Every structure is written in structure tokens, then in C-alpha cells.
Design a protein around this ligand. Structure first.
Ligand SMILES: [Zn+2]
Ligand SMILES: [Zn+2]
Lengths: 78, 81
DNA sequence: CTGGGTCAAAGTTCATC
DNA sequence: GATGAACTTTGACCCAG
């Protein structure tokens, strides 16, 4: 591989919903959109996302997905 | 490989295994024990045979067996909110 | 290449000592 | 405070097209 995840910095093989992303962030974004998940996420504090801490705050992760350009409309409701 | 509805045994204590945890076929007991040990960096005075009935009698030996059977500290992840 | 699905193995909770 | 049965989410890998 040569691409990296725009969300968390993990290895990325391709683009998912408009953005270079890892299998993790692809799966996470899919589930969030499909289930209409809203995250309260205790203390968001610094919404820093990296491979080791991506699962710490779901709110911070989702917000980063949108900030980097992931498209809700690109998630097929199958 | 491992499958959730298939009968397996714990490599540490011989109890019924709920699949592989941290690289080794283990029970929910040895999984939770290893997880807590690594997450808290727990120190065990204890320093013994590890089996279903006597696995809680010596925590030092339970932990040393987890490592000896191939449980990986790096497989334990960071806590989630 | 992109999408989606699967399900093992990561996660957490808490009743009961 | 520890344990571990039961519950929830993640993501590596497969594959349709
Ligand atoms: Zn990612
Ligand atoms: Zn065990």
C-alpha cells in the first residue's frame, strides 16, 4: 500500500465515500449513517484521532469523517 | 480457524473456550484476567498449577501461563468511552 | 477499482463474591 | 476490588460487479 487514512492515519488501500480511508473508518462510517447514530460521547475534549485512539470517542471520529469529506449520500442503504 | 459455536478449550486453564483471545484459545475468565492485568499493569505478589478450580489461587502463575501460552500484551487495546 | 457483508475477536457491563 | 457470563462494536478479509 501507498495511501493513508485521512481520518486516523492507518493504512488505506482506496477511497471510501469520497475519502482515502482505512477498513476501520469505512466500517465505522457505514454503521453510523445506516443506524442514524448520534454520539454523546462523555468527554470529547481534544478530538484527536489516530490509529491507537480512534475508538476512544465515537463523536470525535464521526465529526472527523465529515470534516475530511466523507459523504453520507455515498453510503447505500442496502 | 476459530468459530463461536464450536467447542474449544482454554490453553491456560482447560475451561470451555469462547474462541481465541489475544492470540490464544482461552475462556472468558482468562481473557478478562489478561485484559485487566495489562490495562492496569497489575502486580502479582503470588510468586502452581493453573486449572478451572485453582486459576484464582495464584495470579502470578495465571499471568505467567497466559504469556507462556502466547497471549500478546500488544493485542490488548486502549479503553473506550 | 468501488460498494457491501460477515463474524472472530476486539470492546464493555455488572451480579456476586 | 476481582471475577467472568453476557452483551456490543470493530475491522480484516471476501467478493460482486
Ligand atoms: Zn482510519
Ligand atoms: Zn482459562
Amino acid at each position: 500500500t501507498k495511501h493513508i487514512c485521512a481520518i486516523c492515519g492507518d493504512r488505506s488501500s482506496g477511497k471510501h465515500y469520497g475519502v482515502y480511508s482505512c477498513e476501520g473508518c469505512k466500517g465505522f462510517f457505514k454503521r453510523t449513517v445506516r443506524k442514524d447514530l448520534t454520539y454523546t460521547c462523555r468527554d470529547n475534549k481534544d478530538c484527536l484521532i489516530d490509529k491507537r485512539q480512534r475508538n476512544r470517542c465515537q463523536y470525535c471520529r464521526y465529526q472527523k469523517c465529515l470534516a475530511m469529506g466523507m459523504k453520507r449520500e455515498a453510503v447505500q442503504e442496502e
